[PDB]
Amino acid sequence: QRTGRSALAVLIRACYRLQQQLQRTRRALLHHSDAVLTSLHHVRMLL
Amino acid sequence: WEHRRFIVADSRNFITPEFPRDFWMSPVFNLPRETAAEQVVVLQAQRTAAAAALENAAMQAAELPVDIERRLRPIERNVH
Q: How far is CA B58 from the centre of its chain?
A: 25
The C-alpha atoms of residue B53 and residue B31 are separated, in whole angstroms, by 35
- Cβ-based neighbour number of residue B57 at 10 Å: 19
Nearest chain A residue to B63 by CA distance is A32
Return all residues near B53 (Cβ < 8 A) that are at least 6 apart: A39, A42, A43, A46
Contact (CB, 8 A) for B49 and A46 = yes
What method was applied to determine this entry?
Answer: cryo-EM
Name the DSSP class of B12: T
Contact (CB, 8 A) for B22 and A12 = no
The C-alpha atoms of residue B72 and residue A12 are separated, in whole angstroms, by 21
Contact (CB, 8 A) for B77 and A21 = no
* B58 inside 8 A of chain A by CB: no
The C-alpha atoms of residue B57 and residue A35 are separated, in whole angstroms, by 9
Q: Mutation test of the interface with chain B: which of A16, A36, A38, A39, choosing the one with the most B Cβ atoms within 10 A?
A: A39
DSSP A9-41: HHHHHHHHHHHHHHHHHHHHHHHHHHHHHHHHH
- Count how many residues are written for chain A: 47
Angle among Cα A8, B75, A2 to the nearest 5 degrees reads 10
